[PDB]
Design a protein around this ligand. Sequence first.
Ligand SMILES: Cc1cc2nc3c(=O)[nH]c(=O)nc-3n(C[C@H](O)[C@H](O)[C@H](O)COP(=O)(O)O)c2cc1C
Length: 147
Amino acid sequence: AKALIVYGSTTGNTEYTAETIARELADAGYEVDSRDAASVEAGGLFEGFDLVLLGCSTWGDDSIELQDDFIPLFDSLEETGAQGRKVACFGCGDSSYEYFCGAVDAIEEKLKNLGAEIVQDGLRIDGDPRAARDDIVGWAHDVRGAI
Ligand SMILES: Cc1cc2nc3c(=O)[nH]c(=O)nc-3n(C[C@H](O)[C@H](O)[C@H](O)COP(=O)(O)O)c2cc1C
């Protein structure tokens, strides 16, 4: 299986998150292509991949904004090829906020309307992903046992 991981990380939390998952997938024998949203190019980005993992942090106070590097991809997700594609989402936030990880909820909803298959509900990290380390290892394990 070949997987694409694309992440949008401001203070590298979600970045750290993306690495933990990749290691997980690689150890399992997956081929893993990992890309920072900052440089990705949206059209057919998902083509030739058996699994597409998408990560993004939640920002904003009383509004939900998506991590900055991510926006442009988010805007161009219909150019992707997400139709019939096997996807899962992840991201870091803080529960103290009104829309916890609301950026996760978004990417999900969008994926869903484009026609992707949502293999697993989103990993929503509250806090330092470094302290949720095990939760991550496990979600990755659960995503794989769902393809
Ligand atoms: C000013 C700003 C506003 C934030 N807004 C949101 C919020 O609306 N929802 C949420 O769950 N997290 C909120 N968070 C927290 C970030 O998502 C969080 O600090 C996260 O770990 C950043 O991850 P990243 O480094 O990958 O970009 C906010 C953090 C700050 C500093």
